[PDB]
Amino acid sequence: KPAVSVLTMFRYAGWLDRLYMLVGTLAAIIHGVALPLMMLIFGDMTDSFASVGQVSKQSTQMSEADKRAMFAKLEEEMTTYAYYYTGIGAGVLIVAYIQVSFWCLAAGRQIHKIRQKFFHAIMNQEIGWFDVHDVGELNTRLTDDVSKINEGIGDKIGMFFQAMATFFGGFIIGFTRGWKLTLVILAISPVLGLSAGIWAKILSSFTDKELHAYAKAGAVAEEVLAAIRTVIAFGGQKKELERYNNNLEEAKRLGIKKAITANISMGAAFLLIYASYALAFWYGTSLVISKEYSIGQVLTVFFSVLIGAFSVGQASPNIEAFANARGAAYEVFKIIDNKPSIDSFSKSGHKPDNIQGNLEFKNIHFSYPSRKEVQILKGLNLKVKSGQTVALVGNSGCGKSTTVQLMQRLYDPLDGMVSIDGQDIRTINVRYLREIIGVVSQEPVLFATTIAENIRYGREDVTMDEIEKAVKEANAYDFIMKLPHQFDTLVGERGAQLSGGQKQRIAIARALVRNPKILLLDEATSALDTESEAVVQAALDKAREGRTTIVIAHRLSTVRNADVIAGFDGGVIVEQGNHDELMREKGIYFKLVMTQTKEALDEDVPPASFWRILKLNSTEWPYFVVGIFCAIINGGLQPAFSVIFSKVVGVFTNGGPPETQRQNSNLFSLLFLILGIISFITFFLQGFTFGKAGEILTKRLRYMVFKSMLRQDVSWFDDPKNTTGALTTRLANDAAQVKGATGSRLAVIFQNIANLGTGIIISLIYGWQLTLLLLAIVPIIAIAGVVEMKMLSGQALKDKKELEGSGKIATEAIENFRTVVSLTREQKFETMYAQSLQIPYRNAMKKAHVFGITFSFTQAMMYFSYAACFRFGAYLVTQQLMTFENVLLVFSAIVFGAMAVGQVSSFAPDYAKATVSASHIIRIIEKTPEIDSYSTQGLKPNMLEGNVQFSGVVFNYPTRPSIPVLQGLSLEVKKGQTLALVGSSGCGKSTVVQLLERFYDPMAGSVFLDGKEIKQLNVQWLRAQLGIVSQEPILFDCSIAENIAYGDNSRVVSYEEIVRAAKEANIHQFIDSLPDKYNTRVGDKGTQLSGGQKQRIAIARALVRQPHILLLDEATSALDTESEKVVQEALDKAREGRTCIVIAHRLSTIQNADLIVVIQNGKVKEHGTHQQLLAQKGIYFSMVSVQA
Template sequence: MIRLSLIYLGGGFVVSLVAFGQVYLFVYTSERQVIRMRLAFYRNIMRQEMAWFDANSCGEMTVKLTDDISRIHEAIGDKLGTAVQYLSGSILGFIIIFYYGWELALIMQIGAPILVLTFAIMGVAYTNMSALESQAYAKAGGVAEEVFSAIRTVQALNGQEKEAQRYENTLVKAKEYGIKKSIASGLGQGASWGIVICNLGLGFWYGGKLVRDEDYEVHEMMAVFMVALIGSQCLGLALPGVMTVNNGRGAAYGVYAIIERMSAIDSASEAGLRPKTLTGNITLKGVHFSYPSRADVKILKGLDLTVPAGQTVALVGQSGCGKSTVVQLLQRFYDPDAGQVCIDGVNIREINIKWLRQNVGIVGQEPVLFATTIGENIKYGREGTTMEEVIAACKNANAYDFIMRMPDGFDTHVGERGAQLSGGQKQRIAIARALVKNPKILLLDEATSALDTESEAIVQDALDKASKGRTTLIIAHRLSTVMNADSIVVFDNGKVAERGTHKQLMDKQGIYFDLVSSQFLFHRRKSLLLLIIIVADCLLQKTSAKVDLVSQLEVAPNTWRRIFKLSKPEWFFVLVGSVAAFANGAMQPAWSLVLAEAIEAFAHESKSHQKDKMRDLSFLALGIGLGNFFSYFLQEYMFGISGETLTMRVRGMLFKAMARQNIAWFDDPSHETGVLSSHLAMEATFVQGAVRTSFGYVMLFVGNIGLGLVISFIYSWQLALVVGAFIPIILTMKSIILLFLILFLMARNAYLFFLLKEAMESMDNIRTVSALTKEQTIYDIFSDRLWKPFEKNMKSKFWISMVSGFTQGITYWAFGACFFYGSRLLKKDDVSFGDIFRVLGCIVFCSMQMGRSMAFAPDFTKAKLAANFIFQLHDKIPPIDAYSKEGKKPAQGSFTASLRFRGIHFRYPMRQDVKILNGLDLSVEPGQTLALVGESGCGKSTTVQLVERFYDPEGGQLCLDNYGIKDLNIEWLRSQIGLVSQEPILFDRSIADNIAYGDNSRTVSMDEIIQAAKSANIHNFVQSLPLGYDTNVGSKGTQLSGGQKQRVAIARALIRNPKILLLDEATSALDNESEKIVQEALDKARAGRTCITIAHRLTTIRDADKIAVFKAGVVHEIGTHDTLMEKQGLYYSLQMAQH
């Protein structure tokens, strides 16, 4: 015994070293593989063609980049090492028993074919269910991304509850697949353990026969049996790890499907011509085209178009006629179905894509800025741009002054999609960014639509100079901007209907003549607006600040109590699962009693006694095997139901908590869409992992060690005390591991959320990134940032692995102490050999189960951090609570909708040093139309946001009728307001659903939808589509043109019949033919309503009851158009600038 004790003592040191190597090396390799996997996934997404992005949402890709790859990480990390460890032990055990006792070993493997078949079938089912579950969660992620990126629209339309319900509906399928996965896991593990135990029972019976027939000695039979038992135990202990691997395999299916997908238009391809010179001749020959997502809608029908080098050609026509499509074909975002697109006589399919896009500059109607500083946004217009060039470009774009008025100047963070800036400010930054590049071909789409009058005149001169010697293609709805073009091309029904100069087309008196005649032209410009464009965007921030959502959390002491309180509706499933897990654990110590009984039976000289005892023990083993089967199945199935239901509940709760927060909360860079989507994908999964899997194994461990200690104290309290002395040491070591894990996971998750936010932003704005050919640059920066914390992470993992290895060594030292002290007790006759074996058996099984249960300790750490984040956000009541039921709701007849701003002072929460409103006093009487004018950044849009109560003023009072706006119920308030913004946001659903979204308080009838569409002049277009009102508009409305999107947004505003109408350049995106009709519709809609209109184009507000001219955050002038013109003040100057 002393020799055996010394072997265990030395073995403990060896095991400590080997266990350290196992944990550290598996963690090391898995960390590297996951980084490379994320990079490969991200890189291949960024090289896909636009048609692929039309069919796959950014939110779905984010879920795969976060949740799915995290599952793969689990599958190839230390849990894989644990599975390999136990499988190796099992395989080695089977080799040994066949070598030393093949006959007995063979009998004990009768159930092996059934075991293999069962496990294979369940493994396939588990993997398939995991893959389907991942797909369902990806769809839910798409919904979350869409909602949070358009949170202003959602809250303005009181859509939070509706979106929460939509999000939860997408989770139902995931829940169903998760429960089916639990059934597969329960059947697989239950059958495996049941068959193994039954095989051992068969071994009792046949082994006894071999001993009685004197074919085996007792020690030979027991050696084979014990090795078989340990091997079977190892096989069972490997099963959770194997299930984790299968879960990772299911997630890997969707991830690798994207990694291995070949792009139809590969932006990273090195193939293709790179001409040394480019003159800029553009030719489209017989081009036919329809968008892949709407293949039944023909956009271009044999288009023939030529743009000579150096000329300026304008494309005009009603919305949806194919103008923007030509721009996208020239960038080769799509390939035509038939015909050719040529530059300098060369088909662009033969030209290198990167070279092509580097020589084409584009600016869209809706400027796209990324969540970085103003300076970085501009610098990425061209690599190597100096600060002096940035300043010069800003001065030319009339952006320098407003930038320098900001406390941080060029280091000012613009927020997600430029949310911290006004529309005009964003556009001027985009223009400045464009001016730092020198493209040969310019593509302009209403490039100056967001500029105020004062800025436009100044920018005009710079653009006139910059346009010389370049081929310029202008898409315009406002024909006053294209009259000086070298050639004007009129599109109609996907073809060129007319072409000529402005004078030639007017003389012809055809379609162009009708378009011009139908447009209200208050002024005509003498020079043509030309814009050098490269939609350059800096995706990755250079700020040193990191997202620190997790690392700043103080974990609340009642977190676990609240987690289990959330599971209260499923108490029955949790109870049954816990009882089953406890019974599972109790089965193992019961085996020690069975084995001890077998040893004592063979010590008996009577063969008949041995035969009877072996028969009884065989039946007992059969009972334990069946018990194992049912207990494992019930454990997995019950915790599967409770866990999946909890996950759905927690995800829904977290989504609601996020959607509840006020707009200022979303302005914080640490709460941008990518970060929030990542939290939704990961936090609920972590909580579920603890409740569903880890808690089950804790209960199993409690049953195991509880019964084991009871048995040990019954048969030898002295030996039990010696062994029990090691348990606090082991638990202390495990606690140290948990502490290390908490610190590690907090730091890693915070940094990971920061990176994934940026990755999501780049995917969400892929057209901008592709137009800039910045895919490789963004990938390189993303790669550097992923690898940057690797070495630091490995240092943390080194110490975790060290303590983990030491902990496993302690188990062997406990065995050695047990053998040493047991031998001394045996010599004193204080204990029998059978009792020693009973206690030793309990120690063996308890130690194995302790290792198995503690393997899931990291899941508890993750779950506690995740739950703490969820509960902190859930408990956070925002100052402007979208879910609040408090506040007054004036009766419909008594509410007149007058608005009064009294001494309003305001600054944005994320830009405290910049005062926007400085004591604003303004009023609008019921039914009046108030127009707000002034240069960008003077506070016009801020005023609208205060009316919507996106923010509260820091001083003064905003009143609606005689009520302070803070005293009104927030949902009621917003239901009285119709908002049409300059950049319309539509949702990835049908046209009918988007229009009906205007009133989420009821079910909107189809007749109302059609009437609103007619009023917004969109009905005829919708009817022309094959699916009509059931046509899906795509993510953010990408399947519609700018004008079509705006008209749908107008219809959406009209459907709610609001008392107050807020219009922010509501008709800026409409074509000439539609604008007059829609303007008339809006004029009718304003009747009887209080209306606030923000306008840069002063022609649209001449008939307003009052015009307020803003300057420096106050009303500088106010009056009617005529009175202000007579005054010849600031308004007069703005008007003259448009002549």
């Protein structure tokens, strides 16, 4: 993974930028050391109560002389301590504000220049750059990687400096207040980073082991869902459900262990930090009895050091974000500092005023940049006279268009030069070159705007009248005037789709507006019907007037009208001259003449479900029974801590017998380690309870889910929201993550309710007014912590949604770069981009201010809470209300308990994502279809007749109830006789075949099989005797024997049936010939096969079940040569003794059908045999008159 040097990355910072960064950092530093200072002052705070405990404990000394020496003293000390606390907080809001605000600000101002110059840089690149690069990922880079470099030069490093300042502040205050104790805790430190480092490796080892564990089930997942039509059709749903399941109980069982080890990692962590508490206090409290360190000093150094330690942990992601931001900056700066071979942005060449129009190509050697290994043009020589129209032909290779591509100077020749007049094409400016060179591509292209605007892109300073005149010059003024909104009619990608002819003509106009003296036409008529081709070529011929025109077309019809015809054989131009010369010399030209004669949309729709998801995991009560109790223990573990902590310093603040200062000390210290042991117990237990639970739940769930998917109708997979990828992804992620809402959430809610629950009881007994103040302050800060992540993500989305206005412009400007570059106007697109950017950049100032005041609002009262609680608490302890130890206890319980619930909320997966990803699962499983293939109901007679009779039956697709497909068409087919379907196109060609297979339910009307209605029969048994062959047959990545045997399920197929079904489909010859026999895998993972052979296998497939009904629907549209003959020959011998329904567009193998049905609109307007309908001179006579 690459990265830019740090200095190079802030290259686009300036005066004010460097200023903002420096001031910001300076604020970050002082914000950082604020917390350790708060710790020192905390120690200096406890050291004062320590003196008022011991005196008032032992016996009695002075009743009237204590209120003056103690009560009046502590008020006088807390009146200054309050100033210290509140002071530091009041400063903190300011310094935090400057920090976040300024960093965010400067960052934004840099990014703004970065994205723009990135866009400009992409545009500056020549097409040779676009050839070797993927425009798809480049387009995404402009949004994702610039956003990625935005994060990591802003708030993140502000919080990095703050974090490091908290580190050094903590260690400095530590060493300044305490020498020994700091070295103690730091001596404990290297066993934590050694532990967090090995346990991270263990969890990451099984994590990458899961990816390629379940992938063996995802393979048979995507394979099924992709081939689903043939699956339901061949009813292999059972064998496929099983085949899927057999790869589940080997991939998540691997995950059980990982869940376990993860929990053990967390447990070990708590064990070791609790151990550090035990040891640290065991040393410090024994250090205060020898009256070396005070009690408050122990706290000062312990807190400051621990805080400075965790500061790095909270500095780690902030420096990681800076890191990978440099990695992104590498790609972007690369493009910006890159000046291409052709610029193409500033004039450096001449601008001829003649301007003539004489073309010349002298000794052109050129090969494409993508493949330097294959040379294209070798000594290309070709001159073109003024106004003379020259055509290119020969069917050599890309060379043709390459010449055209060389002409607008897209590429530059390897050897030789392309000269216009007496000057080379490189000795002239490139902008001006392409302004005087028009071009019409093989595929037209229009930008999402108005026709008028699409024209403007050819020339900006054109009046409406000029636009009109130009439109007329392209024979486009007719249909455009017919458009509803005239010239303001929308076009392009989204809105008002046009025909290829119209779209192309508009482009002819666009080019014509430039008034070029040279006109290039690369397959302009190509990919167009014979009717539009007339008008298009008509405009073109009138556009070749007064202009020097080179033209390449696949159709030699419009070629003979040129002045010079040039032929291409290999890399050189061999035959050149008039039409008659090339006809007379019988060249390549003559030979050709004779040879040619959804992510958001998904998550939005489901409502629900409040805690019903748990009912899914409910199948295993015990794991949860142990889990909940364990969770309550691990939860009550935290309140215990804050109690025992308050008891450590309590015995050194409330005095008492000095002889009992040690006896107590060592008790509590050791007890902490005890509190550690049980903490490693709970997590070891939890990882066996919930950990297993959600995993079993996962496996099981997927099974159910997958089964559910196979139950659905075919109408559900046609639904635009359910694709094989989205379904397999739904299966791979949301099915696993459901566990989040089951065990883990119970664990969290119980650890929380135990912690804050029991903890609030304790703090309520040890304090009335103080606890009531704390249960007031803490929730208020907690609400702020929510609002913090509300206005953060909230205005994070608002910024992106106003950034799509740019994203569109960029995207359109990139995917059609090769187009715009020929119309120049790249700078016009840049200007559009900036005009789109000017609005969210203006909202970056207010943005920074907002992040500022929000962050500072949260951060400010985080110290004011200390100030309030300790002031009020001091007010308590000083007066008759007791005591200090109780103040510290209440504080610790409620506050650090409240932080504890934060950590517990952060552990488990996100409940929101869990629930929404669960709802899809519960809806998918509980989804009852119209057509059920699992039902064990149905007739199943003894009659092997098979008569198909559609009566009435009007149908329309559920996906799109617009222009119904079947308007109640009717027909009938008897046994043996085969039907034929003829029409303009599909619908309802395929629809009928699909209805017999029962893929849909017609709104009104019925379809009868034999004497019974279809809906009365068994769904599966109906498809048990229905054979089906689509246009593009698919096989399974298993094997051939299984593929053939896949036709008939719920039975042992064996060698006999397969060889018998192979020999009659005429595929047996191809099997022994290619090593080895039947064991081969198809396809893509094994030996590839041509469509012919694969389809033959697909026939031998449908033939195994001995179907009395074959459904043939546009079987072979892509089969050529003598491969289509043997296929249909193999078909003909299996069409006897079976009812068949054939659909073809060939119209040459329908002449021998028994019945031929001409379906038009939504009904049958012609029926009978071939010659019968032929003598009818209806629509069948006009449809068969195109066979010449």
